[PDB]
């Protein structure tokens, strides 16, 4: 498991919109945490999400220190927590917050960090990560007293000393935010030039989503240059279809988890069948073929499991419409083979300088017939906010085999006169936009999960999601104007029947 403590700052500063249309930084913080919660419910991840505030008047915590309100102890997310955080959305949200939580109250980071350590103390589950995701737009919260800063620094050093990471998701303070003053040595630096001041929602939301999730190797493999020279890498899949997680049928009365056994016994004696008592069969015509399960899972061994290197074909030959199944991402795991990262760095550097892939043969696990994959290099991309939007390593591309690639009919290639191409260039340029990878969000998941949340609180009707992936047809027509008519009279006959 993994516990994280959104340790929001409730001081007066977060409530001060800097005279702009954007949201007050406390409000970005709350919309961000609500977004993290709903997200961690989409993936069905079981991690633990606590919400804390510091700098307020009241307090609801373990030891009852001053101005430290633990709004939700360490527990899984649910409908109630999402709605409770939603209550602080918008200007009315800040209004409600300043009613049972007065702002602008002195504090000490040492005590709040001690409170968080104690939040981690009570739980007992084996959690792999514990991070306190501090939100602050105050460079020197202890600028008026050295003792407070000293205790806070010592405390943070202790938290890191016990295996608790200490993030810092500073927000947009006027005059910049110089992390060097007070937060130089509070954050666990596992170098690592730190992020930029989050300005609006989306920047902070992406930085949060990039600092909370932790890489899970979809597998660990050996990339082999020969019989001997083998490096050890990890295949992380950076994208996979997040399916609408499947229902759990529960005991009708008490609503408890239930079991679904797999008992396969004889229709005569009833004794359950050891796997050794059954042979695997296949029928062709009137003929039948029988062979043992080991010999239907070993008419496959080609390789050991892993990537084994075979050539360096230049990238121009790796076409773009030869796509088979989602691509993975290969990155050195220098834990196993001391020194693998070095040779991987060399190979990436000089695969980039020469614009050349590395065609390999990939067998995921034992007893699998290989594909031909191509390790296409790709170099880091520190975006304008200092996020990492294209991580360094070898993308891994799956190349089809001639059984895959289907052959399509064709009718005589008819081409249009450059007049028509020009007018369609005009229509094209009226719809340009800047697609970015994390732009759209599924209708079915969001519709179904709002349906669920409504059914999770006995509401009348659910919150229908306003669709994004639809064409904004009215506005888009009004954008083109009469261009479409020009094109239609250009190409279609007067008496065309497009329906």
């Amino acid at each position: 498991r993994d516990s994280l403590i959104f340790l929001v700052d409730a001081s007066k500063a977060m409530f001060e919109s800097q005279s702009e249309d954007e949201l007050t930084p406390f409000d970005m913080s709350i919309q961000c945490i609500q977004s993290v919660y709903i997200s961690k419910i989409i993936s069905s991840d079981r991690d633990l999400l606590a919400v804390v505030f510091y700098g307020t008047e009241k307090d609801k915590n373990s030891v009852n220190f001053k101005n430290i309100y633990v709004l939700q102890e360490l527990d899984n997310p649910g409908a109630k927590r999402i709605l409770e955080l939603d209550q602080f959305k918008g200007q009315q949200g800040q209004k409600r917050f300043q009613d049972m939580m007065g702002h602008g109250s002195d504090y000490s980071l040492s005590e709040v960090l001690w409170v968080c350590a104690n939040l981690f103390s009570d739980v007992q589950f084996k959690m792999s990560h514990k991070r306190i995701m501090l939100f602050t737009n105050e460079d020197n919260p202890h600028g008026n007293d050295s003792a407070k800063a000293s205790r806070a620094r010592t405390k943070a050093g202790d938290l890191r000393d016990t295996g608790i990471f200490l993030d810092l998701m500073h927000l947009k303070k006027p005059g910049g935010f110089d992390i060097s003053l007070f937060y130089r040595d509070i954050i666990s630096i596992a170098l690592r030039v730190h992020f930029e001041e989050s300005s609006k929602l989306e920047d902070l939301l992406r930085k949060v989503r990039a600092k909370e999730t932790r890489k899970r190797a979809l597998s660990r493999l050996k990339l082999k240059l020969n019989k001997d020279i083998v490096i050890s890498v990890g295949i992380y899949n950076l994208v996979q279809k997040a399916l609408k997680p499947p229902p759990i049928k529960l005991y009708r009365e008490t609503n408890e988890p239930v079991k679904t056994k797999t008992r396969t016994f004889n229709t005569s004696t009833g004794g359950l069948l050891l796997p050794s008592d059954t042979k695997r069969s296949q029928i062709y015509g009137s003929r039948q073929i029988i062979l043992e399960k080991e010999e239907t899972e070993e008419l496959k061994r080609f390789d050991d499991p892993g990537l084994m290197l075979m050539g360096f074909k230049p990238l121009v030959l790796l076409k773009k419409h030869h796509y088979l199944r989602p691509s993975l991402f290969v990155y050195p795991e220098e834990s196993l083979v001391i020194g693998s990262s070095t040779l991987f760095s060399a190979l990436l550097i000089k695969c980039l300088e020469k614009e050349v892939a590395a065609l390999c043969r990939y067998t995921p696990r034992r007893n699998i017939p290989p594909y031909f994959v191509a390790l296409v290099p790709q170099e880091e991309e520190l975006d304008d906010q200092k996020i990492q939007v294209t991580p360094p390593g070898f993308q891994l591309v799956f190349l089809p085999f001639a059984d895959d690639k289907r052959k399509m009919p064709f009718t005589e290639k008819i081409m249009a006169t450059p007049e028509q191409v020009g007018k369609m260039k005009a229509i094209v340029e009226k719809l340009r936009f800047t697609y970015r990878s994390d732009s759209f969000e599924n209708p079915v998941l969001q519709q179904h999960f709002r349906n669920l949340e409504a059914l999770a609180l006995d509401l009348m009707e659910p919150e229908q999601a306003v669709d994004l992936t639809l064409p904004k047809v009215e506005a888009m027509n009004k954008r083109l104007g009469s261009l479409v008519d020009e094109f239609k009279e250009l190409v279609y006959p007067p008496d065309y029947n497009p329906e």
Binding site: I42, N76, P77, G78, A79, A210, K211, N226, I229, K249, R252, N255, E256, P257, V258, K259, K261, T262, D277, R280, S281, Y284, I290, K293, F302, M310, K313, K319, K320, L324, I338, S341, A346, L348, I349, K354, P369, Q388, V389, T390, P391, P392, D403, R406, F410, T411, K413, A416, M424, I427, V428, F433, H448, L452, T469, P471, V473, F487, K488, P498
Partner: protein, 524 residues
């Protein structure tokens, strides 16, 4: 789309028993290729009628034996669905001969086979092959008739030869006889072959004359009866007044086996004697049975839980649609963000010249402007809508929009990997440059062609057929012919057609040694 009528015509005259050590005899290579063909035509349970015709034998068996003509023409199997009798024949009871036969007479015989046997049978395609080494004299008179009935009986062809149309250890099926290592009779035959192939198909003929190695690492044997795709009609709409009536096909649809291993009892070898029981009890301790009426349909939500108008509150879509969102630079629709286990090619519908004009305009505008449509797509009314990039693709033969689905925000998974190039513990040594650069220059699978400008690829691994299919089919065949014996190891044309040309390994031998000496690796 219904049936094909193939007629293999093997040559087995004495010339093909020329077994040069290190090189498979042409006869055994023909055996390997026809095993590949008929395996994948029986086991995939296709409905193609194969007829094998063997010439080169000592006997005679055909409808044209009269007049003491067409000697060494043994019709081994007339047109019928292929079964395991044929697959046993191909390697047990089909043996070389001492004659040398006229393969043009073999063509005329096969033409007779197809034109006669296929009288009461409706066939969409008619196909023929020849597996000859071209070492027999022949008379070209009836050639005039051959073509004069080929196109008029609507029959294709395909030629296989032990030598290509363009040295060292002859890896069968690998990725390499010399065209100057053949005889004059072979050259004359090959000229006749090229003549007939051109006369059938224009310049496209000389792509139909495959080697025997080359045919073991291609789907060329099936190339001319492969099932036509399915046209998915739809309407690519921009706005609501720009509707382009299109047809989309699947292109790169991964291929997997169509028969699952049924489980049967190890002794009586039947399935019905087995059943699977999956009954519900409490999963926690105190495992009590819970009835179906005691079980209802419920979803999880973080910690809370929900039970489950209810059945009818399923999401709704607006029907089959291929509409646009908005076009964007082709440098932002990267490729590492593709989803879906397929790819589509979108053509303008057939019989719609105007629609073709419109879509060609769209494609060319996209390509010149260097940017790609981000369309929305939903297979049918009951489908989950998805947004995918439709980007241009113009071939000299056709223009199309290649569609590939794209992620959503709740599909991606932004991680943060530490930097490599900026790292300090892996400092840039001269070893980096010299060693890895030499290695890369060695193992290149591309070479600039004879014209020093353009680039050929040595090892086109988007063209091999899937090894697991022939491995599986070999093993099933072996257990259908040797029930008492273990599975064979993997054949060698396979283990060769899944390996780089030996030139690569030979050139790379030394850089790899340099790396191993210079980049110390040690496991924990």
């Amino acid at each position: 789309g219904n049936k094909a009528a193939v007629v293999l015509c093997m040559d087995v005259g004495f010339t093909m028993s020329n077994s040069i050590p290190g090189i498979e005899s042409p006869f055994e290579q023909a055996k390997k290729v026809i095993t590949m063909f008929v395996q994948r035509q029986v086991f995939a349970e296709n409905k193609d009628e194969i007829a094998l015709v063997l010439f080169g034998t000592d006997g005679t068996d055909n409808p044209l034996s009269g007049g003491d003509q067409y000697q060494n023409i043994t019709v081994h199997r007339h047109l019928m669905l292929p079964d395991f009798d044929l697959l046993e024949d191909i390697e047990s009871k089909i043996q070389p001969g001492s004659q040398q036969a006229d393969f043009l007479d073999a063509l005329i015989v096969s033409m007779d086979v197809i034109q006669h046997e296929t009288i009461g049978k409706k066939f969409e395609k008619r196909h023929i092959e020849i597996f000859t080494d071209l070492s027999s004299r022949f008379s070209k008179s009836q050639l005039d008739i051959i073509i004069h009935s080929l196109k008029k009986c609507d029959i294709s062809l395909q030629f296989f030869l032990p030598f290509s149309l363009g040295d060292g250890p002859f890896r069968l099926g690998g990725h390499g006889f010399p065209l100057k290592g053949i005889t004059e009779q072979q050259k004359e035959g090959l000229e006749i072959v090229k003549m007939v192939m051109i006369s059938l198909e224009g310049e496209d003929g000389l792509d139909e004359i495959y080697s025997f190695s080359e045919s073991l690492r291609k789907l060329c044997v099936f190339k001319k009866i492969e099932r036509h795709s399915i046209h998915w009609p739809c309407r690519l709409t921009i706005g609501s007044n720009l509707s382009i009536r299109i047809a989309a096909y699947k292109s790169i649809l991964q291929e997997r086996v169509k028969k699952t291993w049924t489980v049967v009892d190890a002794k009586t070898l039947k399935k019905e004697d087995i059943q699977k029981e999956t009954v519900y009890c409490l999963n926690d301790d105190d495992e009590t049975e819970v009835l179906k009426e005691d079980i209802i349909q419920g979803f999880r939500y973080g910690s809370d839980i929900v039970p489950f108008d209810e059945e009818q509150m399923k999401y709704k879509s607006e029907g089959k649609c291929f509409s646009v969102l908005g076009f964007c630079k082709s440098s932002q629709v990267q490729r590492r963000f593709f989803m879906g286990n397929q790819v589509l090619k979108v053509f303008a519908a057939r019989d719609d010249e105007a629609a073709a004009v419109a879509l060609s305009s769209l494609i060319h505008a996209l390509d010149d402007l260097d940017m790609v449509a981000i369309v929305r797509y939903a297979y049918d009314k009951r489908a989950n809508p998805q947004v995918g990039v439709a980007f241009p693709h113009i071939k000299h033969n056709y223009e199309c929009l290649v569609y590939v689905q794209l992620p959503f925000m709740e599909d991606l998974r932004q991680y943060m990997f530490s930097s490599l190039k900026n790292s300090k513990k892996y400092a840039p040594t001269e070893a980096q440059l010299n060693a890895v650069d030499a290695l890369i220059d060695s193992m290149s699978l591309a070479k600039k062609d004879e014209k020093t400008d353009t680039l050929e690829d040595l090892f086109p691994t988007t063209k091999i057929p899937n090894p697991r299919f022939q491995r599986l089919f070999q093993c099933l065949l072996h257990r259908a012919l040797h029930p008492r014996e273990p599975l064979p190891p993997i054949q060698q044309h396979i283990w060769n057609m899944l390996n780089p040309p030996a030139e690569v390994t030979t050139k790379s031998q030394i850089p790899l040694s340099k790396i191993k000496t210079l980049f110390p690796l040690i496991e924990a």
